[PDB]
Amino acid sequence: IFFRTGVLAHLEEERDLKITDVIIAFQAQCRGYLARKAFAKRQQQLTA
Amino acid sequence: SNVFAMFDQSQIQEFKEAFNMIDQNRDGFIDKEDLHDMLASMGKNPTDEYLEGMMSEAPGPINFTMFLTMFGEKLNGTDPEDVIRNAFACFDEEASGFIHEDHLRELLTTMGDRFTDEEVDEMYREAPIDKKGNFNYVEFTRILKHGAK
Amino acid sequence: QVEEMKTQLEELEDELQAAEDAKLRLEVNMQAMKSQFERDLQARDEQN
Amino acid sequence: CDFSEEQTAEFKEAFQLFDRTGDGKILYSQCGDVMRALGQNPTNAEVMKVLGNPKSDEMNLKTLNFEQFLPMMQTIAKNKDQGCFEDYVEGLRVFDKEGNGTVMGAEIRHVLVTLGEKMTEEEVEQLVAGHEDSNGCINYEELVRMVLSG
Ligand SMILES: [Mg+2]
Numbered sequence: 001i002f003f004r005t006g007v008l009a010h011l012e013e014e015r016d017l018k019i020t021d022v023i024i025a026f027q028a029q030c031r032g033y034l035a036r037k038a039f040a041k042r043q044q045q046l047t048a
Numbered sequence: 049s050n051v052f053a054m055f056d057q058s059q060i061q062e063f064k065e066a067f068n069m070i071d072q073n074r075d076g077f078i079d080k081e082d083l084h085d086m087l088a089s090m091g092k093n094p095t096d097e098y099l100e101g102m103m104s105e106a107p108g109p110i111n112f113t114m115f116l117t118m119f120g121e122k123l124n125g126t127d128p129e130d131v132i133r134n135a136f137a138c139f140d141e142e143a144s145g146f147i148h149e150d151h152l153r154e155l156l157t158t159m160g161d162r163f164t165d166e167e168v169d170e171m172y173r174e175a176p177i178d179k180k181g182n183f184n185y186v187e188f189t190r191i192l193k194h195g196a197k
Numbered sequence: 198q199v200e201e202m203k204t205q206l207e208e209l210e211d212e213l214q215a216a217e218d219a220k221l222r223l224e225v226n227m228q229a230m231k232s233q234f235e236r237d238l239q240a241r242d243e244q245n
Numbered sequence: 246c247d248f249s250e251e252q253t254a255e256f257k258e259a260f261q262l263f264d265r266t267g268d269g270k271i272l273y274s275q276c277g278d279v280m281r282a283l284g285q286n287p288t289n290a291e292v293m294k295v296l297g298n299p300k301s302d303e304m305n306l307k308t309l310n311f312e313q314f315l316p317m318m319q320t321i322a323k324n325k326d327q328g329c330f331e332d333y334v335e336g337l338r339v340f341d342k343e344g345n346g347t348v349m350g351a352e353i354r355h356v357l358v359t360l361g362e363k364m365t366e367e368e369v370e371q372l373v374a375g376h377e378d379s380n381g382c383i384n385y386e387e388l389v390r391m392v393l394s395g
Contacts, residue, residue, distance in 0.1 A: 016360055019336050024361040026333055028286035030372055033395030035281040039263060044228055048135035049211035134229035158267055
């Protein structure tokens, strides 16, 4: 299917913007896990 | 509290065997005749009051038991060289034996109980600091615990 | 009896201090085991 | 307060464990990291409700004691619930181009950096365990199933 200039890239932007809201929520969870891991390591380092 | 009860059979045997070489008159005490003559036989003969000032650490006389508690209280808090090397390896994750002076400073001058700038300087003017400010803790633990030394 | 209990309590305090020192040492040795485990695991992964 | 005495004690322990610069009061930015270490996933907007220093806050002058920390932990805890793994993997099923239940590592790592809040490659790479080896198509099930343990 052929399309005129840039339409697919703007539809892709809109589609990604639709997903960004839940992506931020998941990102907060993953960054939370990372922070918890880092802190737990820091505790072992502190006791050492 | 009674510190003597804290120590390993090997450590007690080492102290006992060492003491047996020093207790040359076999009276069980630390005395002017024995250790001064021994040190004169083993080195430069510092038989001056510098040694009396060391013998005077005990309350009056200096029995084997008092020697043991003195060295005990002095060893209170100390740990194995491998365990200390493990504790350092928690920061030196690559186990390079090459921890930086900035890292060492960060770990000590604010974090937890504060080491003084004088204590930090002591760790450079006696302990194994090296080029570019790398610090060889594998050598440090050896001289700290007096193991393989 | 007060003197006896004082001696006993001081002995129990000494034993408790020894036990806490031992607990700390066992913790740091467990951290050593963990460190060796991680290092060896990473070495085997890198060799693989 | 909805937290138990044991939870309050644990939070107080954590508060003084994740220290220090020098003072016994936690830093304004670092507080958020403590909340995240306590397994919560709020947005930075939750902190912006208190709005300590409207400008760039390297100085962190809005330090907190435990009595100021605990209410923030509570409003975080009562903020929202979080969805199941299906809500996550639906996003991946939309991002995917193969239609096979996996996704290209190089693409997904970039997408998860550009979209929404920004993260480093150092942060993102640590999230994956099924690394991009001979096979480019990472099974995103492992990623979500691992991180959701936190
Ligand atoms: Mg003698």
